[PDB]
Amino acid sequence: VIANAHNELIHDAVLDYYGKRLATCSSDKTIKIFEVEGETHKLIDTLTGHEGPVWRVDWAHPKFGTILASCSYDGKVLIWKEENGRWSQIAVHAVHSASVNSVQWAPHEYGPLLLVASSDGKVSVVEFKENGTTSPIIIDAHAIGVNSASWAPATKESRKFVTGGADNLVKIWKYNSDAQTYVLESTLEGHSDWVRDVAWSPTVLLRSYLASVSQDRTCIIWTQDNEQGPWKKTLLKEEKFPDVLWRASWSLSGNVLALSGGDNKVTLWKENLEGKWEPAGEVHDGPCQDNAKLIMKERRFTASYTFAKFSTGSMLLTKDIVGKSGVSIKRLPTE
Numbered sequence: 001v002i003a004n005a006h007n008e009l010i011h012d013a014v015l016d017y018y019g020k021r022l023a024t025c026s027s028d029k030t031i032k033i034f035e036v037e038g039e040t041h042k043l044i045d046t047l048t049g050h051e052g053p054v055w056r057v058d059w060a061h062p063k064f065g066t067i068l069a070s071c072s073y074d075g076k077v078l079i080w081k082e083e084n085g086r087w088s089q090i091a092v093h094a095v096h097s098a099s100v101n102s103v104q105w106a107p108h109e110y111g112p113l114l115l116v117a118s119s120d121g122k123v124s125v126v127e128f129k130e131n132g133t134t135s136p137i138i139i140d141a142h143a144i145g146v147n148s149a150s151w152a153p154a155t156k157e158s159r160k161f162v163t164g165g166a167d168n169l170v171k172i173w174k175y176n177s178d179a180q181t182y183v184l185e186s187t188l189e190g191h192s193d194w195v196r197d198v199a200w201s202p203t204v205l206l207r208s209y210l211a212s213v214s215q216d217r218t219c220i221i222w223t224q225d226n227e228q229g230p231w232k233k234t235l236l237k238e239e240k241f242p243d244v245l246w247r248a249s250w251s252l253s254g255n256v257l258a259l260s261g262g263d264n265k266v267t268l269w270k271e272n273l274e275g276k277w278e279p280a281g282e283v284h285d286g287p288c289q290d291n292a293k294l295i296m297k298e299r300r301f302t303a304s305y306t307f308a309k310f311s312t313g314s315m316l317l318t319k320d321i322v323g324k325s326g327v328s329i330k331r332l333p334t335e
Contacts, residue, residue, distance in 0.1 A: 002289035008321035009292060015311040015329060016059045016066075022317075023068055024327055025054035027292040031070055031080075033087065034325045041325040045087045049078055053295055055101050061108040069114055071100035073295055077116055079128065091128060095136060096120050099299070101147050102197075107154035115161055117141075117149035123163060123173075125182065137181050142167050148197045153204060160185075162210060164195030170212045170222070172231075188212070190220045190233050194300065196261075201250040211236075211257055213245035215300065219259060221277065236269060236277050243304050251310040254334030256280060258308045258316060266308040266318050283308070283318050283330065 013024040015036065022034035022041060029050045035042035052074035060067035066082040075098050079091035098120035106113030116124040121143040126136040141149075142165025152160035159175040161182070172186040193216035201209030210222035210231075219236040241262030249258045257269040257277075270280035296302075308318040313331070320328035 002287070003322065004285055004287050005321045006285065006326070008319075008326040010319060010321075010326045011054065011305075012056045012307055013317050013319075013325075013327045014057050014059055014309060015315055015317050017062045017312050019311065019313045019315055019329075021059070021066070022325060022327065022329075023057045023059065024325060025057045025070055027053040027295075029054060029072070031057060031068075032325070033068075036329070039329075041323065041327070043325070047080055047087060047089075049089055050074055050076070052099075053292060053299075055099070056103050058104050060105045060112060063108060064112050067112070069103045069105065071103040071116065073099040073299070075100055075118070075120070077103055077114070079114075093124070093126055093136070095124055095138060096122060098145070101145075102149055104149065104151055106151050106159070109154045110159060115149050115151055117146040117163060119145040119147075119166070121145050121165075123149050123182075139173070139182055141165065141171060141173070142169065147195055150198050150200050152200045152208070153202045160200075162198045162200050164198040164212060166194050168193055168195060168214070168216075170195055170198055170210075170220075186231055188220075188222060188231055188233065190222075191218065192216045196245060197247045199248040199250050199257075201255055201257075202252050203250070203255040209250065209255060211248040211250065213248045213259065213261070215244050217241045217244055217262065219245055219248065219262070221257075223275075234275060234277075244302060246301075246305050247307045247309070249309045251314065251316075251332070251334040252312055253314070256310075256332075256334045258310060260306045260308045261304065264304075266306065281332070283316070283328070 009027040031047040033045045050072040054072045068080040071077045077093035096118035102117040123141040145166040149163045168191045170188040173182040174185045191214040197213045199211045208224040212220045217240040221234045223232040245261035247260035266283040268281035
């Protein structure tokens with residue numbers, strides 16, 4: 001009836017490719033690594049190096065070894081690697097001059113490719129190559145600041161990714177061989193406030209599925225039937241959600257969408273009739289019977305902030321301030 005919780009200001013978490021390694025990052029500048037087995041989480045190492053709140057973390061594909069990517073408000077991205085049980089920092093990606101808000105590895109087919117979004121208004125793509133053919137591609141995306149960037153599924157010029165800025169816009173970028181960089185292929189203007197997160201669905205059918213989440217308390221599903229055709233705008237539901245939406249995540253199959261924010265619970269959404277979206281599920285020292293405050297004012301984060309992410313093996317990890325790791329992981333059949 002009355003619960004005493006730990007300092008769970010965890011901002012992000014990610015489950016590796018099998019489901020044996022969990023990583024969480026928080027506002028207290030620390031990254032934790034958990035050994036996942038069954039329904040219990042074993043802390044094994046605390047990674048330190050960031051001089052500010054850590055916003056995101058993302059595992060690389062196991063075919064590159066055990067590699068973790070983390071980004072922070074300190075404007076830096078850190079690449080961590082485990083060698084014979086030894087966790088060591090093996091890279092510093094500090095090209096951005098402002099809070100780095102998101103990081104995500106590309107589809108393995110492209111290689112050890114990292115996508116980065118920053119409040120400095122730019123997006124960087126760095127192919128780390130262990131033995132050293134490594135130059136970064138830097139792009140101006142959302143002058144007023146980029147909040148999130150997400151890769152598109154694999155099918156060089158076929159490489160694509162979506163971004164969401166503090167200018168209320170969603171932008172789609174494709175790689176151009178002749179230009180030697182990613183170019184703006186589309187701009188979408190559905191939202192009336194900060195786009196908190198954008199997610200490109202891995203589903204492989206006719207249309208392309210795209211989900212944008214905004215500070216205006218609405219979610220938009222973007223669709224594209226033919227590869228060069230326009231982009232259709234479709235509100236998830238007709239009316240606004242009670243509160244701010246923070247995150248969106250597509251399951252690796254079954255095309256199910258997981259929303260963080262809006263209602264007081266992580267809500268799932270599936271599409272079962274042409275262009276109709278409906279709820280398909282849901283998920284639910286301080287006693288509730290420092291500077292993180294300021295940085296969150298500028299970052300416009302509130303107390304109702306939460307996250308949720310789909311993972312291979314059909315898993316969904318959500319924020320749970322009561323767990324040992326502060327994260328819950330439920331396997332979820334999605335078809």
